[PDB]
Amino acid sequence: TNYKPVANHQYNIEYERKKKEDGKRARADKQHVLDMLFSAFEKHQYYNLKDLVDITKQPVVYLKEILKEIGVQNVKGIHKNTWELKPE
Amino acid sequence: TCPNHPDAILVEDYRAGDMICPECGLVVGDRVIDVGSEWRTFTKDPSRVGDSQNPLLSDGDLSTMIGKGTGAASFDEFGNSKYQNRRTMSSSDRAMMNAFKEITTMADRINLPRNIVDRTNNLFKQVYEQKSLKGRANDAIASACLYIACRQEGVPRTFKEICAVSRISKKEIGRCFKLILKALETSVDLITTGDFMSRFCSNLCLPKQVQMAATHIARKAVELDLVPGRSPISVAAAAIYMASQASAEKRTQKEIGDIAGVADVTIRQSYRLIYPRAPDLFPTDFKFDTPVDKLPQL
Amino acid sequence: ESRGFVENSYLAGLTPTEFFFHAMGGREGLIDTAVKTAETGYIQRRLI
DNA sequence: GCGATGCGGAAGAGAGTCCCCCACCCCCTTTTATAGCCCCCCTTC
DNA sequence: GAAGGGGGGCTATAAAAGGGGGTGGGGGCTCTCTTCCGCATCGC
Ligand SMILES: [Zn+2]
Numbered sequence: 001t002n003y004k005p006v007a008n009h010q011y012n013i014e015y016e017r018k019k020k021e022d023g024k025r026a027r028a029d030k031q032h033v034l035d036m037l038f039s040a041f042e043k044h045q046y047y048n049l050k051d052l053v054d055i056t057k058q059p060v061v062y063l064k065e066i067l068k069e070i071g072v073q074n075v076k077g078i079h080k081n082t083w084e085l086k087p088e
Numbered sequence: 089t090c091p092n093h094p095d096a097i098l099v100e101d102y103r104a105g106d107m108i109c110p111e112c113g114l115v116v117g118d119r120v121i122d123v124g125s126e127w128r129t130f131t132k133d134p135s136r137v138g139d140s141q142n143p144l145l146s147d148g149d150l151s152t153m154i155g156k157g158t159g160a161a162s163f164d165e166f167g168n169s170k171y172q173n174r175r176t177m178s179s180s181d182r183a184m185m186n187a188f189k190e191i192t193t194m195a196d197r198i199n200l201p202r203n204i205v206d207r208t209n210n211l212f213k214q215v216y217e218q219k220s221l222k223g224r225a226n227d228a229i230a231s232a233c234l235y236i237a238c239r240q241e242g243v244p245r246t247f248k249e250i251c252a253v254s255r256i257s258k259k260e261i262g263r264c265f266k267l268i269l270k271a272l273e274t275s276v277d278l279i280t281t282g283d284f285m286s287r288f289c290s291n292l293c294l295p296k297q298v299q300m301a302a303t304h305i306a307r308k309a310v311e312l313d314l315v316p317g318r319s320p321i322s323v324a325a326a327a328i329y330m331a332s333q334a335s336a337e338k339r340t341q342k343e344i345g346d347i348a349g350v351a352d353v354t355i356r357q358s359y360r361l362i363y364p365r366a367p368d369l370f371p372t373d374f375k376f377d378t379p380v381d382k383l384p385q386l
Numbered sequence: 387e388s389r390g391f392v393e394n395s396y397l398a399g400l401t402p403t404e405f406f407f408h409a410m411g412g413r414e415g416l417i418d419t420a421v422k423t424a425e426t427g428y429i430q431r432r433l434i
Numbered sequence: 435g436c437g438a439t440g441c442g443g444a445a446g447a448g449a450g451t452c453c454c455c456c457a458c459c460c461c462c463t464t465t466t467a468t469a470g471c472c473c474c475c476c477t478t479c
Numbered sequence: 480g481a482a483g484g485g486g487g488g489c490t491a492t493a494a495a496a497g498g499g500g501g502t503g504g505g506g507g508c509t510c511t512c513t514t515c516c517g518c519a520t521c522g523c
Pocket of ligand 1: 090092093109110111112113114
């Protein structure tokens with residue numbers, strides 16, 4: 001009764017269904033992302049790119065492009081270089 | 089290389105340790121050197137050579153690992169050892185090593201012999217080096233290679249059976265399977281109903297007589313073309329159900345489907361196609377615990 | 387008898403305690419023979 | 435008052451028998467024919 | 480409420496389009512000899 005033949009694993013169809021139901025992140029307009037981007041900066045002075053993506057819910061490439069124009073990367077030797085939401 | 093015998097094949101007399109001309113008996117060259125180990129494998133082993141390099145490793149390297157420290161000189165000022173092993177394995181070799189580990193893990197799940205694993209490892213190396221499937225996950229390639237190795241060895245496993253032992257789904261295995269065949273410019277013989285009878289019937293715990301009856305029923309049904317276009321696994325599951333119901337050891341459709349990986353509806357449909365000609369399909373010398381007339385009608 | 391005096395001959399045969407104590411004495415000779423082969427061998431090499 | 439040093443004893447070696455970033459590719463989607471397979475809901479009694 | 484039935488989705492096939500996300504590949508046991516330390520000794 002072990003390793004019974006199966007077309008797809010139950011854990012895999014659920015994850016596939018969840019990904020399909022959620023759908024891919026859409027590329028929103030720059031103005032809305034900027035407004036949401038700066039509102040996030042208010043809560044925390046420093047933000048990680050991986051965590052920042054979740055707040056913005058935007059594609060990584062699109063978020064980086066908009067963040068690159070205004071945001072800058074500050075190198076921290078303690079952990080790693082992260083992004084700065086302050087334009088200056 | 090006898091001077092007086094152009095193009096003569098010298099014969100090695102190992103006991104005498106020399107190469108001789110078979111024609112004149114002249115001894116040519118120096119003493120034959122035994123290229124094997126100078127020690128014997130029978131206190132510590134007096135070996136001065138490393139373990140054999142893995143044949144299935146593109147640009148496979150050879151290296152030594154630093155052992156555990158013993159004295160205080162081996163340890164840094166604060167505990168941790170100053171001499172620590174470093175990861176010097178190539179990315180290509182590291183990925184290939186992980187795939188072989190995955191190939192063996194899947195094979196052990198369904199108790200595949202080591203020869204099939206070795207064939208799978210060779211298949212993965214060719215696909216990995218050919219690099220037509222570089223876009224696909226290595227586990228899917230390994231799962232597809234495992235499927236192909238079973239077919240090449242004459243003991244096919246169903247895509248569902250391979251998927252059960254693999255995190256990769258059946259669809260992704262089937263897709264990588266097609267690409268691997270294209271990349272390798274190789275083919276696999278078509279599966280027949282008899283390629284699964286031994287495993288399916290043994291897993292269902294059916295006697296040899298019932299297994300033989302199921303093997304005959306499926307083979308005869310295919311020859312009679314009573315199940316055109318049906319998957320061979322569906323035909324075999326229906327044949328096993330027919331043979332099982334005609335003997336003392338009776339198995340339900342759910343039982344046969346679970347081992348066969350076929351939904352009970354599919355077994356019902358295939359069985360319904362071969363049920364009308366049940367007496368013709370059964371072997372002549374079959375002892376019917378349940379008469380063929382009283383076989384289930386569904 | 388308690389401390390390993392065998393009052394029997396080999397022809398007469400040893401009593402179970404004598405047999406065991408005799409085995410204890412014999413083991414000493416076997417240990418010496420194994421020891422003597424290597425202990426003296428090193429001395430011979432160094433002298434040479 | 436102000437330094438300076440050889441020997442015994444103890445200790446100690448040394449030999450013998452991970453987390454991230456950057457290409458590159460696949461799938462998301464649409465259309466259609468084909469057919470076996472299988473999930474899901476419905477229906478039967 | 481178990482079981483069969485019906486309907487529909489999944490599978491593959493080509494192809495185009497454009498972008499997000501997944502995947503893989505770099506990178507910040509005994510004996511003997513030697514060495515070091517504490518001590519008491521003189522010397523200046
Ligand atoms: Zn000759």
